[PDB]
Amino acid sequence: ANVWGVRLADSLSSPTIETRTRHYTLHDFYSDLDASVGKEPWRPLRNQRTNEIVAVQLFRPLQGLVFDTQLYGFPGTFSQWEQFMKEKLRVLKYEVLRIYPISTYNHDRVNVFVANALVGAFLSNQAFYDLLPLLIVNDTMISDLLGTGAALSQFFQSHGEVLEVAAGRKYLQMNNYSNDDDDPPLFAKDLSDYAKAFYSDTYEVLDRFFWTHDSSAGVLVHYDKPTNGNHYILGTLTQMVSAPPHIINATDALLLESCLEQFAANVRARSAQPVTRLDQCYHLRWGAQYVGEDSLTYRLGVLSLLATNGYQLARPIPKQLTNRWLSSFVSQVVSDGINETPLWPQERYVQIAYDSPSVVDGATQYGYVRRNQLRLGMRISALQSLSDTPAPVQWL
């Protein structure tokens, strides 16, 4: 085993096969706009008790909702919001289709950042037409966007060999989200500016970028499979409450959601089916001096290392997270106790033990270092959970 809240014993596991991705093309970008009933970007979250739609998770083509909620004028209910979005995306689709004819459909890659910021500018009525000639990519995604100054600075900006975008609103809050204990938590991703991503070609440019600029809150990495090129994530100092005995700022909730996804994915691994990422974690990189010893950020960094090495939690994780279970887990992890695990976080590289079942150290190029010195006394298999049996059972 236990750190402060107990995790499961010896059987540790991890996914094995990683699928490879394909580039986002105009043939797919046309299809994402005219949202069919089978394929649509949004998928609805819902309350567990009342079984009502309270939140919406957004996907690939619209992920640039960085402005405030009153700028967009969204409806309150999900059934009206979905029809609103389906009605407006085709009006944008014809505007794309006039400038770029559909005869170019075969193997023409589009810029993902321009694709997100175009729908973010059109839904917010902020000067979209400059971004439209910059949609087709050439020579890389970022260097087409470094020199330019066409789009508005809220979407993206350049600092010289470093592209800074403003990632925003993975989730979207509906009208009847009343912060109930059965509501799904949103992890401070219904807010305007919870993080800022910093894209570049190599990591040596970004490491010199964070020598001049401050890393006060803490910076986060992917190190497995970056979305649109290798980058860092810098969290801000806004706060999601969501859990009445606790206050969790953005740079801790952003780490905690990614830790819980990997704790969930270490159970579902059956050594035959592939996943999209061998690990989901973040592993705090530079700000570890400014964060406190044995505080919430340090303890979630320890748990994020444990999830990467492949440990499993004792009590099971629900399929949909609830706001009461999340508060219980945070109150269980902020308790007293010592770290029984020989793993310890380090700024220089995230390490992997010798008998960890994860094969990501050979998969990616670097960032992951197979440390040979430290060894854990556990053997690999998945856990075995089962039903409830609500009557008390006789024991002998």
């Binding site: 699928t19 490879r20 394909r22 043939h27 046309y30 559909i102 005869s103 459909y105 592939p274």
Partner: protein, 198 residues
């Protein structure tokens, strides 16, 4: 998994446009014949539909190690005629591709055909002359024998397999094999009658 054409077994599809009643070019003909050489003796499903304001058709089929063995037996690939595909003026709505199409399952007459064909393929060794005694429902035998083995096949119907440009000798002829005075002209080492004597 996502596929890439690197696995031995798997699905593979094409998508070439077809504007109106156009005689298709040599490029599309080479492409369709390349699909028919890449996968052999499997079922091919097609679907013609206007995608993105343009008429396009797809050809869906499933490659196999037996067809990979078949592909090695030919020095040149043949060309298909476009006459079966130039006529179509309809709009076949497509569907998502699956790896295992038959959800009802295989019939016993197909499962017994596999039992015959596996014993034939285990019996035939490499570098041997064979002779097929009766085709059957398809020309499965060309995918059963190893690649260097020269074959010949008797029938009562004219065949539909392409003639010429093979890596080894083959002979496709029909003569109603119950007659006499024709085996003295032919030369082989092992006969195979499967589901034809009855």
């Amino acid at each position: 998994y996502v596929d890439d054409g690197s696995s031995v077994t798997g699905i593979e599809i094409i998508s070439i446009e077809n504007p109106g009643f156009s005689n298709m070019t040599q490029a599309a003909r080479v492409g369709i014949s390349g699909l028919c050489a890449n996968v052999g003796n499997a079922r091919k499903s097609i679907a013609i539909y206007e995608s993105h304001g343009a008429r396009v058709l797809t050809i869906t089929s499933r490659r196999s190690p037996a067809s990979a063995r078949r592909k090695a037996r030919l020095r040149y690939l043949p060309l298909i005629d476009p006459r079966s595909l130039e006529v179509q003026a309809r709009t076949i709505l497509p569907s998502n591709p699956v790896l295992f199409d038959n959800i009802n399952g295989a019939s016993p007459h197909v499962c017994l055909t596999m039992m015959y064909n596996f014993e034939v393929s285990s019996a035939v060794y490499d570098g041997d002359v064979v002779l097929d005694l009766g085709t059957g429902p398809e020309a499965k035998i060309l995918e059963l024998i190893p690649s260097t083995s020269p074959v010949t096949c008797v029938d009562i119907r004219p065949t539909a397999q392409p003639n010429g440009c093979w890596n080894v000798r083959t002979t496709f002829l029909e003569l109603d094999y119950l007659s006499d005075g024709w085996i003295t002209g032919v030369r082989g080492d092992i006969v195979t009658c499967m589901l034809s004597l009855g």
